[PDB]
Design an enzyme around this catalytic site. Structure first.
Site, mmCIF file in Angstrom:
data_model
loop_
_atom_site.group_PDB
_atom_site.id
_atom_site.type_symbol
_atom_site.label_atom_id
_atom_site.label_comp_id
_atom_site.label_asym_id
_atom_site.label_seq_id
_atom_site.Cartn_x
_atom_site.Cartn_y
_atom_site.Cartn_z
ATOM 1 N N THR A 271 -11.016 -7.964 -6.457
ATOM 2 C CA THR A 271 -12.129 -7.062 -6.770
ATOM 3 C C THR A 271 -13.051 -6.805 -5.574
ATOM 4 O O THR A 271 -14.071 -6.138 -5.692
ATOM 5 C CB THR A 271 -12.959 -7.582 -7.953
ATOM 6 O OG1 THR A 271 -13.185 -8.983 -7.788
ATOM 7 C CG2 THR A 271 -12.225 -7.341 -9.275
ATOM 8 N N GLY A 272 -12.677 -7.334 -4.419
ATOM 9 C CA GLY A 272 -13.455 -7.120 -3.218
ATOM 10 C C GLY A 272 -12.790 -6.085 -2.314
ATOM 11 O O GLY A 272 -12.390 -5.011 -2.772
ATOM 12 N N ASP B 160 -22.489 -12.962 -5.429
ATOM 13 C CA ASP B 160 -21.179 -13.476 -5.063
ATOM 14 C C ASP B 160 -21.165 -13.796 -3.569
ATOM 15 O O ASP B 160 -20.514 -14.747 -3.122
ATOM 16 C CB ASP B 160 -20.083 -12.449 -5.396
ATOM 17 C CG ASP B 160 -19.968 -12.174 -6.895
ATOM 18 O OD1 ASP B 160 -20.086 -13.127 -7.697
ATOM 19 O OD2 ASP B 160 -19.743 -11.003 -7.272
ATOM 20 N N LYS C 222 -9.629 2.741 15.597
ATOM 21 C CA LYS C 222 -8.348 2.552 16.254
ATOM 22 C C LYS C 222 -7.409 1.840 15.306
ATOM 23 O O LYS C 222 -7.800 0.909 14.611
ATOM 24 C CB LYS C 222 -8.511 1.739 17.539
ATOM 25 C CG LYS C 222 -9.145 2.525 18.683
ATOM 26 C CD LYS C 222 -8.254 3.695 19.110
ATOM 27 C CE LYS C 222 -8.984 4.628 20.067
ATOM 28 N NZ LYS C 222 -8.121 5.741 20.563
ATOM 29 N N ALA D 240 -9.850 -5.686 -1.105
ATOM 30 C CA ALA D 240 -8.583 -5.172 -1.609
ATOM 31 C C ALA D 240 -8.793 -4.046 -2.644
ATOM 32 O O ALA D 240 -8.021 -3.094 -2.688
ATOM 33 C CB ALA D 240 -7.766 -6.309 -2.206
ATOM 34 N N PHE D 241 -9.841 -4.164 -3.461
ATOM 35 C CA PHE D 241 -10.188 -3.162 -4.476
ATOM 36 C C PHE D 241 -10.455 -1.808 -3.782
ATOM 37 O O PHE D 241 -9.884 -0.788 -4.148
ATOM 38 C CB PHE D 241 -11.425 -3.661 -5.253
ATOM 39 C CG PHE D 241 -11.893 -2.755 -6.364
ATOM 40 C CD1 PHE D 241 -12.733 -1.678 -6.105
ATOM 41 C CD2 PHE D 241 -11.544 -3.021 -7.693
ATOM 42 C CE1 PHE D 241 -13.223 -0.882 -7.154
ATOM 43 C CE2 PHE D 241 -12.028 -2.231 -8.749
ATOM 44 C CZ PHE D 241 -12.871 -1.162 -8.480
ATOM 45 N N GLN E 277 -16.947 -13.880 6.612
ATOM 46 C CA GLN E 277 -17.894 -14.761 7.294
ATOM 47 C C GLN E 277 -17.468 -15.210 8.685
ATOM 48 O O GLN E 277 -18.231 -15.077 9.638
ATOM 49 C CB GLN E 277 -18.175 -15.996 6.436
ATOM 50 C CG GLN E 277 -18.506 -15.680 4.991
ATOM 51 C CD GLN E 277 -19.672 -14.734 4.855
ATOM 52 O OE1 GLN E 277 -19.652 -13.835 4.019
ATOM 53 N NE2 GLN E 277 -20.701 -14.931 5.671
#
Ligand SMILES: NC(=O)c1ccc[n+]([C@@H]2O[C@H](COP(=O)([O-])OP(=O)(O)OC[C@H]3O[C@@H](n4cnc5c(N)ncnc54)[C@H](OP(=O)(O)O)[C@@H]3O)[C@@H](O)[C@H]2O)c1
Ligand SMILES: NC(=O)c1ccc[n+]([C@@H]2O[C@H](COP(=O)([O-])OP(=O)(O)OC[C@H]3O[C@@H](n4cnc5c(N)ncnc54)[C@H](OP(=O)(O)O)[C@@H]3O)[C@@H](O)[C@H]2O)c1
Ligand SMILES: NC(=O)c1ccc[n+]([C@@H]2O[C@H](COP(=O)([O-])OP(=O)(O)OC[C@H]3O[C@@H](n4cnc5c(N)ncnc54)[C@H](OP(=O)(O)O)[C@@H]3O)[C@@H](O)[C@H]2O)c1
Ligand SMILES: NC(=O)c1ccc[n+]([C@@H]2O[C@H](COP(=O)([O-])OP(=O)(O)OC[C@H]3O[C@@H](n4cnc5c(N)ncnc54)[C@H](OP(=O)(O)O)[C@@H]3O)[C@@H](O)[C@H]2O)c1
Lengths: 249, 249, 249, 249
Positions: free
Chosen positions: C156-157, C49, C126, C159-160, C211
């Protein structure tokens, strides 16, 4: 030296019986738990963690328990059918014992619990207003499906599913956690097991280790009993803890 | 008897002097923490929990600290300016002390932490592969933004935000929890603070109580030190914990 | 008809070339992503992915992408080395295409993100004070390590790991969730993707699909762009979703 | 123009009656919801979100609903006693309507649900094995105290307490989440409300909006129905959501 072998299904009872025989131990098989179990030198549980919980509901004074896990995960067992001989031999001869506290609540004076005492609503899908106090101080009041007061051994059971932390077997403490709490924020509380837990709720039901339950209304008290569950020392208890937990389901 | 008064901003430093004066205590003022505070009978901290954390970073031997909460929530403080004169006198008079363990990691030999030792990645938005071991046995390996090793006192800090349980101040232990773990299932682990923690990670950074950091690659060990944080006894510490926690912001 | 083949490692780039041969397709091998890829009829990703996220970064208009996962789990891929052939033929012959929105934030105009736009503190360990507004209305102000604004695909990235829910690919929406929120209560918010997301934070940095990043101070806005990512239609996308998520790690 | 005023207590029935009379709207009083409410131009609810749920149980075709909140938090409400007269006039004069989907269960063919269809264990403190399928594909199998299939409107109800996400009112979808799941890892699932849900379990009960329930053994399906709940458009529904969710208890 005599021992009692408790089992649910006929599983591996034959071989287990012969093994206790070669170790020159008198044997008495049991279809189900019975207070008669107090009259032995040690007990061999054949099944799972549930089996051991059921056995402990009959014991007050508790003879050494050696558990054989017949299923998937056994946080309380010592071996599987694959290696019980080696381990049993070591346990029966080294005879090193180990203890973990059991709790009781005022609503059921004669019952002891290893995992936890749960206060649930009588009807399903219905909430209850639960007030929590420990050592006299009001620590919380919340609407939920039920409330869990568990030992560190119970941290991997009901408390675990409610979102509780997994606590090391050798660290004594209470884990207070709600089941389906209806509030924006909430957190599980880990307090000393020397403290007194008081749970206040209406139209509720108290359950201990998922075995004995009694309807109740008002207030109950939960504290550390004087009769611990006794097992043979499991040298790798801590080590296996993390691996056994990741496979729960 | 002499006491050092450490302050963030000189807002009440006057009232406090005229209060320690009345109590016949020699007084000295420090705008920033210093190793010299170690030469006083007791210390008065004006500000917040952070202020107390910064003070501790200067103390090996730890004179009793009396904290005056400048703002909102102060789990480590003893009172606010609205009533410090009263609580200050009870503290100086009774002079009953209380101690909480401090920890240290091998990457920074001489630094002590009251809250936690956290291991994060050097670059933001980038994960690190972390391996965990306590008392020798491998407990876990997970990809995450970072990993926290906190004491019960730190259970309400960084560990709390990562979803850790609220742990009572008088129960010694380690809360082991990851920050943003990239895995389906995961749980915080609560283990005895007598054990040795080991974190293995590459391209990582170690931070103690959010004050001292240092880059490291490989293994670092964390364990209970011999130099506790010492505060004047807070008779209501247990009861005020639950209230302060619900107001955390 | 000519197609571009992008790969990280020399994995199975050979057989993949020979398969596109038998399909009478002209091949062009790329060792890394290039804005050049826009001049192809379709792209074939060989990696994971991450590989696909890197390719999309250089595509405004997006020719059909066909991913081959050489890794463990690939929510954006179509097949593994073991069955790319059969699936590649089906895809190229039927040539059915599927689309998922990409987002962009004011701080970085030309960048598009398929997974998410994340706001993190410049220095690690921080917190940052984050304010959140959607469609001008104020929704939340909170202290945290960072704040994520993801699409259903990014659910599913990052946030998961922050504790967010998994949203199926075909339900377009935004997922607003903080990383290590320092507050008693908090919840992931799921709002329509037609809305305007506004994030206000000082001493922060914005990242897109991990990226491209830019330090920023003040306020950035996030909204649905006009250039979706385009893949070949994956028939089992939905059913594969739930199995792939349980293996994440 | 005739309207029915449903109330739980004598509360402000009088002032509400004059308010509507003063609007040339013929009114009628109802102590408890009735199937007769389908014979009015609009309905005025006095109580809380529960009042609204109990009113919807007796309505297939749904006349617009105007809610006056007696309690502390009413996500389905329109105004409080302090200013209902004002908002009431704007509602009855603009007569702008808003619709939200209600789902139906196969175990109870004629019941409609706005919040959720919940599958729980029949006996308290007892887990059930629940299998889940949406659109005929196996999505999960888990042991738990229950399982919730909610709509975005229900995302602030039972699903909320089970740890589900907050989904804005205007994003139609299903929230699939278990109650007290006994497994190492688990996630709430959010799928399109156009899909068919199937829950499979033995010795269980199905409950709709916590009002009507029936015992079932086997398989039940849940789908979006054709009879939505209807309310006067609440201009600030989206902005008030985040404020109301943060005060839930
Ligand atoms: N998570 C939940 O929803 C839920 C609901 C009710 C009760 N429980 C727990 O189960 C006990 C009562 O059980 P029951 O009679 O209703 O049914 P069981 O005993 O039929 O069900 C309990 C399940 O949990 C496993 N288990 C028990 N104690 C455990 C522990 N300390 N750590 C990890 N797994 C454990 C059991 O052993 P296995 O290896 O032996 O079979 C079994 O799989 C309680 O003490 C409570 O902790 C959990
Ligand atoms: N949750 C997070 O995302 C996060 C991130 C980094 C660090 N931290 C914590 O903050 C410390 C490092 O401090 P810093 O210099 O970065 O920032 P601060 O010290 O600027 O920030 C820490 C905040 O946490 C509060 N706090 C400190 N110790 C606490 C404790 N034991 N229990 C509950 N609240 C506590 C402080 O209260 P006072 O000033 O307000 O009264 C302050 O509001 C670490 O020990 C760590 O626990 C948390
Ligand atoms: N969970 C976390 O703590 C965390 C931290 C930073 C960034 N991220 C995510 O990583 C991406 C940034 O890339 P990077 O260069 O930092 O790292 P990678 O892309 O180096 O690492 C991201 C990891 O996440 C997987 N992944 C990427 N997109 C995914 C998706 N939509 N669903 C499920 N898994 C997915 C990747 O799968 P492959 O092995 O197939 O490449 C890879 O294992 C962002 O999309 C962000 O969401 C997550
Ligand atoms: N969290 C839990 O443990 C739990 C347990 C059972 C039922 N429920 C919910 O309550 C409903 C069944 O009601 P009941 O007869 O048991 O008791 P109630 O209706 O006596 O209890 C439900 C409570 O939830 C609030 N509520 C209702 N719908 C809501 C929604 N969509 N969003 C946010 N809060 C909402 C109600 O508000 P008002 O006081 O203003 O009416 C009330 O305080 C179900 O639809 C379910 O969502 C939650």
């Amino acid at each position: 030296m005599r021992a009692a072998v408790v089992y649910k299904t006929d599983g591996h009872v034959k071989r287990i019986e012969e093994a206790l025989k070669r170790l020159e131990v008198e044997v008495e098989l049991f279809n189900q738990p019975s207070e008669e179990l107090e009259n032995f030198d040690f007990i061999v549980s054949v099944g799972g963690d549930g089996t051991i919980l059921r056995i402990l509901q009959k014991l007050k004074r508790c003879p050494p328990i050696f558990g054989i896990n017949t299923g998937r995960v056994g946080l309380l067992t010592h071996a599987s059918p694959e290696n019980f001989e080696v381990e049993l031999k070591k346990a029966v001869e080294k005879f090193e014992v180990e203890r973990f506290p059991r709790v009781s609540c005022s609503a059921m004076p004669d019952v002891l619990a290893l995992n936890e005492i749960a206060v649930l609503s009588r009807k399903p899908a219905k909430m209850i207003d639960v007030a929590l106090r420990v050592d006299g101080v009001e620590v919380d009041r919340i609407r939920c499906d039920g409330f869990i007061v568990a030992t560190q051994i119970g941290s991997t059971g009901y408390a675990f599913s409610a979102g509780g932390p997994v606590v090391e077997p050798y660290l004594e403490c209470f884990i207070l956690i709600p089941i389906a709490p209806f509030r924006f924020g909430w957190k599980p509380y880990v307090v000393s097991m020397e403290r007194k837990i008081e749970v206040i709720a209406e139209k509720a039901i108290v359950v201990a280790d998922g075995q004995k339950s009694v309807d109740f209304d008002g207030e109950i008290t939960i504290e550390k009993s004087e009769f611990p569950a006794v097992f043979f020392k499991n040298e790798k208890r801590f080590r296996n803890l993390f691996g056994k937990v990741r496979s729960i389901g």
